[PDB]
Amino acid sequence: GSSGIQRTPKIQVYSRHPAENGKSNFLNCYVSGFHPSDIEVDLLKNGERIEKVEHSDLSFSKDWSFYLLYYTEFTPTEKDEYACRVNHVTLSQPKIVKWDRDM
Amino acid sequence: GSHSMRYFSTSVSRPGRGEPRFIAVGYVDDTQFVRFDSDAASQRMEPRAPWIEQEGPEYWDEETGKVKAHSQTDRENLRIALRYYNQSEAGSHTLQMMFGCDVGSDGRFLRGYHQYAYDGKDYIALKEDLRSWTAADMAAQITKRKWEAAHVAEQQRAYLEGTCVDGLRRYLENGKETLQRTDPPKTHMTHHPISDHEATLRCWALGFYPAEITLTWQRDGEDQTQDTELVETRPAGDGTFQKWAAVVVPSGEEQRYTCHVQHEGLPKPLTLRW
Amino acid sequence: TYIKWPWWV
């Protein structure tokens, strides 16, 4: 029952600090520029949904589009892979964006 | 420089899945400091920045009463808007409100705002003179006529020039160690080969505050306006922000490009070269 | 400080 001009979320998955294996960090998924505000966001570790993930309070930008930050503490390693999964009315299927230490 | 206070509220209906949800957040500049969530258990305005926790119990009582009243008003406003537009109850609709004020370095009032959006599009907005309204469509003109008859703009003008400015000035003093800071961007460049004929040069800005920043790429002093990839400025989670810009460069031409960084924490803009 | 007044559209 979406209403108004739909805008697809822009998704970024990244760490708070440059990654160093064995060093505690935060894994972030920032979703922005979307409408309507109904959205599902998860952080994944090796393809599996991470349980203790926090998120910011829904807010929006000058153009009225919404943004949210999902985040969890994590200690990266050389082998472990991480990703963000997003579902939104504008997406035909959930979108999974893998974490790349260089983005 | 100048400073701003903003409150942002979102009301969303969810037909068949419960009553509408109301969420409000308050910001000074790019720092959130309160929230209210109609779904949450506390049913209180809650602190979200260290420097607001020193407010006494009657602050929290008063702020809770004001925001809960707004929550109820905007829930009824979703109903009214449905009627104005003759829209079906089956659809999920959104009502957003923004209000707040700007002050200068000396604390003087610079601008006030009080505006609404329905389903993501302008609905009605208080004009800069704080005396008149801009109505976006025929439904909002019904509202405009109603608010003109009830002299709503007079009350909002009084809030914006009075209470709003007083609170912002006080928050800036109470959180001065944190709100009156500028963290300049830490900058660097990375290089990522694509094929054997092309590679990506990425120019990075990290750890900066406030979030406003400009990153641009040039080739031989000429701007690369259309061949640059620029991501949205993003929170680090610790009160600072991050951003990068990237250009695709033919292999061997890296040294033709320069990245340029403007930020209010930099006494002079930067030029980076690979 | 939150607005002291909301109003119906």
Residue numbers in the entry:
A (entry chain B): -3 to 99
B (entry chain A): 1 to 274
C (entry chain C): 1 to 9
The authors write:
The crystal structures of HLA-A*24:02 and three peptides, namely, SARS-CoV-2, 229E, and HKU1, were determined. Overall, we found that the potential of cross-reactivity may depend on the interaction between TCR and the structure of specific HLA, i.e., HLA- A*24:02.
In these two patients with HM, cross-reactivity of CD8+ T cells was also found to be preserved. The CD8+ T cell lines responded to betacoronaviruses (SARS-CoV-1, MERS, HKU-1, and OC43), with 83–100% responders, and to alphacoronaviruses (NL63 and 229E), with 58.3–66.7% responders. Although electron densities of the peptide backbones were observed, those of some side chains were poor, particularly, Lys4 for three peptides, Trp5 and 7 for CoV2 and 229E, and Pro6 for HKU1. Of the nine positions, the side chains at positions P2, P3, P6, and P9 were involved in the HLA-A*24:02•peptide interactions at the bottom of the binding pocket. In contrast, the side chains at positions P1, P4, P5, P7, and P8 were directed to the solvent region and oriented differently in the complex structures. Thus, these side chains are expected to directly interact with TCR. The side chains at positions P1/P4/P5 and P7/P8 can interact with the loop moieties of TCRα and TCRβ, respectively.
